[PDB]
Tab-separated table of C-alpha atoms in Angstrom:
chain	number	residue	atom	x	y	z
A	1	UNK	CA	0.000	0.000	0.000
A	2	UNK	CA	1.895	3.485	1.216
A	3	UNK	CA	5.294	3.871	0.564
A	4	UNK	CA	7.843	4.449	3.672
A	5	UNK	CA	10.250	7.473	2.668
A	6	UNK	CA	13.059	7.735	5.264
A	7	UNK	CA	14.011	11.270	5.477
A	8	UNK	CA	16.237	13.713	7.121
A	9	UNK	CA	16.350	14.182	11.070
A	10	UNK	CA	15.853	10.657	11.527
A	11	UNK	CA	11.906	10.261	10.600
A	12	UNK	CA	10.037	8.552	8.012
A	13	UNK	CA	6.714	9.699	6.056
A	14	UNK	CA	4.302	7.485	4.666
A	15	UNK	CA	3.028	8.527	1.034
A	16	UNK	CA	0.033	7.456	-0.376
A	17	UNK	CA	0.010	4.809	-3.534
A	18	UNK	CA	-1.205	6.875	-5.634
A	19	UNK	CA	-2.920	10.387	-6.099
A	20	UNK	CA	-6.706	11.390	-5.175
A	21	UNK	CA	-9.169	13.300	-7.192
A	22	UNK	CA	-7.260	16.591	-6.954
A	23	UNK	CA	-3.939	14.971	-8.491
A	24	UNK	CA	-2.727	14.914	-4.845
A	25	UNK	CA	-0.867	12.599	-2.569
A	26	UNK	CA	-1.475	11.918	1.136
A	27	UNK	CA	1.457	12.274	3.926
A	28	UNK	CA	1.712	10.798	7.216
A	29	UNK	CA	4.016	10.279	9.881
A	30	UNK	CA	4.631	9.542	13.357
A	31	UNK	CA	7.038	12.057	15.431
A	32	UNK	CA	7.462	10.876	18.841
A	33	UNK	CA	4.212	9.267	19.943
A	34	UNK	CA	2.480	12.000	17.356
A	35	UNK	CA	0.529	11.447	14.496
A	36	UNK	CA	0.955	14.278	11.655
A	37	UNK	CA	-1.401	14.067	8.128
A	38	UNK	CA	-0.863	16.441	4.930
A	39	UNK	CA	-1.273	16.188	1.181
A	40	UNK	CA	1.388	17.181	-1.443
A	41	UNK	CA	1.416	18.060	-4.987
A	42	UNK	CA	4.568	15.318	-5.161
A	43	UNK	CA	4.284	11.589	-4.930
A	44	UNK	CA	7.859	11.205	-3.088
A	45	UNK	CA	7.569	12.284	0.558
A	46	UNK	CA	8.041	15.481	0.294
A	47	UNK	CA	5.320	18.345	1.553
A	48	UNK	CA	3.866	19.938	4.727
A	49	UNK	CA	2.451	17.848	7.509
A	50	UNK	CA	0.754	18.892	10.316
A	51	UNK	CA	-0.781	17.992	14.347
A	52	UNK	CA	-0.833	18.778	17.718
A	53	UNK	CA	1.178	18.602	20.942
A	54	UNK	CA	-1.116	16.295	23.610
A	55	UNK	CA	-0.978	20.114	24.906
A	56	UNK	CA	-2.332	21.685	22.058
A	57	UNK	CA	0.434	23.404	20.727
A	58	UNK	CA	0.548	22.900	16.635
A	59	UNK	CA	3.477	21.266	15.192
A	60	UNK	CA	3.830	21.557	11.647
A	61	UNK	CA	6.679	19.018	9.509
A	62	UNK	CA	8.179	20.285	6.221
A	63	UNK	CA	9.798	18.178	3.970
A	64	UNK	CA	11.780	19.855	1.329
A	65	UNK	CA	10.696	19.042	-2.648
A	66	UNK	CA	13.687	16.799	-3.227
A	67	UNK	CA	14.201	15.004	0.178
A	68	UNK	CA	16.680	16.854	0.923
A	69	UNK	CA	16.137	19.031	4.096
A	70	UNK	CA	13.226	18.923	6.930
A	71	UNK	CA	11.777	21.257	8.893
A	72	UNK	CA	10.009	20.471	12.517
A	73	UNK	CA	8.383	22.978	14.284
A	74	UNK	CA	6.031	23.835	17.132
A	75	UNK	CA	3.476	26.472	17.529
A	76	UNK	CA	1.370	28.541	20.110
A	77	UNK	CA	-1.979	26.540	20.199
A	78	UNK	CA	-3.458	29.233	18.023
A	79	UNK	CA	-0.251	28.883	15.538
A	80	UNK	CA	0.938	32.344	15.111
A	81	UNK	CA	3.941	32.061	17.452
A	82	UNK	CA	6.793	29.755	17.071
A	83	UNK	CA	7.974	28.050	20.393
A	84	UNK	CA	10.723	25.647	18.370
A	85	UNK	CA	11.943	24.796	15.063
A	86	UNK	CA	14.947	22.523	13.807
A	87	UNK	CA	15.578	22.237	10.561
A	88	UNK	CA	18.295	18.981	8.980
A	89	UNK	CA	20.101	20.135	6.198
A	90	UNK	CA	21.281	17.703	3.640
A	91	UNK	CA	24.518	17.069	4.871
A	92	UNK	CA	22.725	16.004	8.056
A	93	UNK	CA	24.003	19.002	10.555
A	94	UNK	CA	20.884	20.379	12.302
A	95	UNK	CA	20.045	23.976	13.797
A	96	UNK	CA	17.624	23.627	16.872
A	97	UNK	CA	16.256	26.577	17.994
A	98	UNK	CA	13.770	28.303	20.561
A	99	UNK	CA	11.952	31.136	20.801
A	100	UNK	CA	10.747	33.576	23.220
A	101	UNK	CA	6.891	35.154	23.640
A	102	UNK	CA	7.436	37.598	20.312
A	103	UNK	CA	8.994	34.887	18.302
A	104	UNK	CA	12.546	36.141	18.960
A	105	UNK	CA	15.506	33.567	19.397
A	106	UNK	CA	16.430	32.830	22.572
A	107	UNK	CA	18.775	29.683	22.092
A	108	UNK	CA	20.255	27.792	19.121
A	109	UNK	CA	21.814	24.271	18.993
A	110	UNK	CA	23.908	24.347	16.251
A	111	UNK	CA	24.929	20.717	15.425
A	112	UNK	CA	27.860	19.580	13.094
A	113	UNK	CA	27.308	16.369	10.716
A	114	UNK	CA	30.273	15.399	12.657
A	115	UNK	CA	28.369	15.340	16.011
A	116	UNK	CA	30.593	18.887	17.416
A	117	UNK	CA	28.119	21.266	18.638
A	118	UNK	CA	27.924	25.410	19.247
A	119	UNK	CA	25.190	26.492	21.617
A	120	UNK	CA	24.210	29.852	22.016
A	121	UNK	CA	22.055	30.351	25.420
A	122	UNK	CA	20.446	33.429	26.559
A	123	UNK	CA	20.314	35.190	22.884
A	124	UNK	CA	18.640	38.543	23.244
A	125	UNK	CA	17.075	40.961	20.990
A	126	UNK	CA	20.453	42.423	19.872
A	127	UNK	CA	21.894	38.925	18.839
A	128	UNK	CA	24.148	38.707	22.276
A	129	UNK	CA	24.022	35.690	24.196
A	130	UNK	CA	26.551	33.074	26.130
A	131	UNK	CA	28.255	30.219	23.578
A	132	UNK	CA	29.766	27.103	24.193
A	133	UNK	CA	31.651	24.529	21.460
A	134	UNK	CA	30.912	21.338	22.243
A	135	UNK	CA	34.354	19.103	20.763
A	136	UNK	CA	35.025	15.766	21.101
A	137	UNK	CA	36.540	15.036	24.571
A	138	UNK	CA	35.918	18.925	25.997
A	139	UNK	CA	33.826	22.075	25.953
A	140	UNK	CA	34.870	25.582	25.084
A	141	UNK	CA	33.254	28.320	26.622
A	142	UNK	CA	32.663	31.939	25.125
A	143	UNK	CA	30.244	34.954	24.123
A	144	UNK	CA	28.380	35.578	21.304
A	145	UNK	CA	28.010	38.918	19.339
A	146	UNK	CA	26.480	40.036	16.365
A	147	UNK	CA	29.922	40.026	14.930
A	148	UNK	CA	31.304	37.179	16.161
A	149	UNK	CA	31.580	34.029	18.635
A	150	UNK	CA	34.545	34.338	20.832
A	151	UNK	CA	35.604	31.166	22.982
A	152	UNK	CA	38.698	31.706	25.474
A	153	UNK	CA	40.935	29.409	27.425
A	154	UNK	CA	43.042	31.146	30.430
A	155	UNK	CA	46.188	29.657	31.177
A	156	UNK	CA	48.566	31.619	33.807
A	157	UNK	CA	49.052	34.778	31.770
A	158	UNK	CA	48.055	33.758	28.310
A	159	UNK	CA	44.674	34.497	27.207
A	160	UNK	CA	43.495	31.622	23.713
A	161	UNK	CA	41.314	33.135	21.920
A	162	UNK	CA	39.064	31.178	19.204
A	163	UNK	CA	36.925	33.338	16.887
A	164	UNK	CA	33.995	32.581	14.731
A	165	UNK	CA	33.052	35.640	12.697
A	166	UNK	CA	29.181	35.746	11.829
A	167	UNK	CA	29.904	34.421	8.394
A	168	UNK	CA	31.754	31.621	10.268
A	169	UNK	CA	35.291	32.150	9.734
A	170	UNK	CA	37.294	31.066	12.089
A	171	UNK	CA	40.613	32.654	13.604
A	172	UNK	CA	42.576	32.503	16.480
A	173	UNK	CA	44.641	35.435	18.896
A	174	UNK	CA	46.792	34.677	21.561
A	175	UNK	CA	47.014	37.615	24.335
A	176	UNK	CA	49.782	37.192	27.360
A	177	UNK	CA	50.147	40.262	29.880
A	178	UNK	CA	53.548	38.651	30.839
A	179	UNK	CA	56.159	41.405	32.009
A	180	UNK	CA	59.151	39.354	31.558
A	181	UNK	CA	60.141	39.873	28.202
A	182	UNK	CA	62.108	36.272	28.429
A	183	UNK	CA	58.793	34.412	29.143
A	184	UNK	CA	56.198	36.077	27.424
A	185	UNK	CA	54.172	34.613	24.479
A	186	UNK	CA	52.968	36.012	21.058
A	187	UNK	CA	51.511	34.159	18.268
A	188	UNK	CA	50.835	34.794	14.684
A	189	UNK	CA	47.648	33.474	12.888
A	190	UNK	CA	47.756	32.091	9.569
A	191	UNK	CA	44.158	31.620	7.328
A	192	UNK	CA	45.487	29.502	5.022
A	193	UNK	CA	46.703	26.508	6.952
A	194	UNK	CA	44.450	27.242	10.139
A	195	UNK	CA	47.664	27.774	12.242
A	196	UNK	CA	48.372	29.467	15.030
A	197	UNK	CA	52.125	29.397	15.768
A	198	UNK	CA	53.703	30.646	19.277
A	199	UNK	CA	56.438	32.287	19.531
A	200	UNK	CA	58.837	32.537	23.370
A	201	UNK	CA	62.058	34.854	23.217
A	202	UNK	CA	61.890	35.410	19.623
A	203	UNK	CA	61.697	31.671	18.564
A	204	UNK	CA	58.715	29.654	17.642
A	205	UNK	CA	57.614	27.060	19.723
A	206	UNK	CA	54.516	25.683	18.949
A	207	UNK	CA	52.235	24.838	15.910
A	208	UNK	CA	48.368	25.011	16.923
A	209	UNK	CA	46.394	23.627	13.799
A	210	UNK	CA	42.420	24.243	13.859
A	211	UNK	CA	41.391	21.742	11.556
A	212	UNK	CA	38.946	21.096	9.079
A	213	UNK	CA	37.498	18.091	11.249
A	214	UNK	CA	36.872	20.359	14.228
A	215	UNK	CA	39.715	19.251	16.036
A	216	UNK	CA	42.859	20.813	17.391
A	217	UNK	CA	46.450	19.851	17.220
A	218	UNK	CA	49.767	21.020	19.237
A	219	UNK	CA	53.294	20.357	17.137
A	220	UNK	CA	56.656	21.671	18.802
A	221	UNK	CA	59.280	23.065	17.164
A	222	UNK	CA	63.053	22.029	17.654
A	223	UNK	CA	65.226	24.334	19.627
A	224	UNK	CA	66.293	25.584	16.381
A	225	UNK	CA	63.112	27.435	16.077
A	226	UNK	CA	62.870	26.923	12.960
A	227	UNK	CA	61.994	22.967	11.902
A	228	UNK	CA	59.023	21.203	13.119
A	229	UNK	CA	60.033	18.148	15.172
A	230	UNK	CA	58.115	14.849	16.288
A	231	UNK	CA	54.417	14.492	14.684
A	232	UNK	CA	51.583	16.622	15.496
A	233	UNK	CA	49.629	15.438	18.688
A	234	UNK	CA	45.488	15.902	18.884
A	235	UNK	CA	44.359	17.487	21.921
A	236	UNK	CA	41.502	15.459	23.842
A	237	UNK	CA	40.754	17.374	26.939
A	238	UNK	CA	40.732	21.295	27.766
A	239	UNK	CA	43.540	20.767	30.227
A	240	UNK	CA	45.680	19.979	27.165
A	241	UNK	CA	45.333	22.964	25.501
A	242	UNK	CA	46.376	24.853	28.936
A	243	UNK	CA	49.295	22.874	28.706
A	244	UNK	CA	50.231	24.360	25.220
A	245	UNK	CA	49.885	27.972	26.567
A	246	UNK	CA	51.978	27.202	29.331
């Protein structure tokens, strides 16, 4: 009979065999213990879906024309307000959002096909809020602006800085108040290899690659200052990257 469509965000529809009077197909689907119905123009899964909460808030499901993305969201019981809405992209990273009493942000759940996260908590009306990446083996903890994301680590003097600009490019400062001029870090950033390299008494140190897998690696230089040494080493834990900054 109906035809199961397995879609984005980890949900199936159900699409009817074939098309009623109108030329149209019908939708449904289960979402948790709910029951959503719809009709489409297309005979594939895709189309709008819609229910109710057990508390009467509407949800509504949107299926994108080629299968490709989904939207869930949740309504006031009347269905003017959003209260939620994530929406699966097609490479399978998800935004999760919620929203406050005039349909204004209030938190979003950013999360990577790779399973890394950014959450932004306590968004208000001028796009501020608190932020936190969410890596594999530690957190990083931060601010958000309207201009950019800005997650710090605090080791002794040094202060790490990780940027995200608000079209997401990332780069990285590093910011010691050290007095003793023998002791005292700098570090230059370079965009094209995602490197951050340290610098102690006028030699390099340390190579600090942010890479394309959201991960971070730590790679010393020899005493020459000049020549890599060893084989970069992944950090797992926040106190690791302390330990570079030290």
């Amino acid at each position: 009979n109906s035809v199961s469509v397995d879609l984005p965000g980890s949900m199936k529809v159900l699409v009817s065999k074939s098309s009623n009077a109108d030329g149209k197909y019908d939708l449904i689907a289960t979402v948790d213990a709910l029951e959503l119905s719809g009709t489409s123009d297309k005979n594939n899964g895709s189309g709008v879906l819609e229910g109710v909460k057990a508390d009467a808030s509407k949800v509504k499901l949107t299926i994108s024309d080629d299968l490709g993305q989904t939207t869930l969201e949740v309504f006031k019981s009347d269905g003017s307000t959003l209260v939620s809405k994530k929406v699966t992209s097609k490479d399978k990273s998800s935004t999760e959002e919620k929203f406050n009493e005039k349909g204004e942000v209030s938190e979003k759940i950013i999360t990577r096909a790779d399973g890394t996260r950014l959450e932004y908590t306590g968004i208000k009306s001028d796009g501020s809020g608190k932020a936190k990446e969410v890596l594999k083996g530690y957190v990083l903890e931060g601010t958000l602006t309207a201009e950019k994301t800005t997650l710090v680590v605090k080791e002794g003097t040094v202060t790490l800085s990780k940027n995200i600009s608000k079209s997401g490019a990332v780069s990285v400062e590093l910011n010691d108040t050290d007095s003793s001029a023998a002791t005292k870090k700098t570090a230059a950033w370079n965009s094209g290899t995602s490197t951050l390299t340290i610098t102690v008494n006028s030699k390099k140190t340390k190579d600090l690659v942010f890479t394309s897998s959201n991960t971070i690696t730590v790679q010393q230089y020899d005493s020459n200052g000049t020549s890599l040494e060893g084989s970069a080493v992944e950090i797992t834990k926040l106190d690791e990257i302390k330990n570079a900054l030290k």
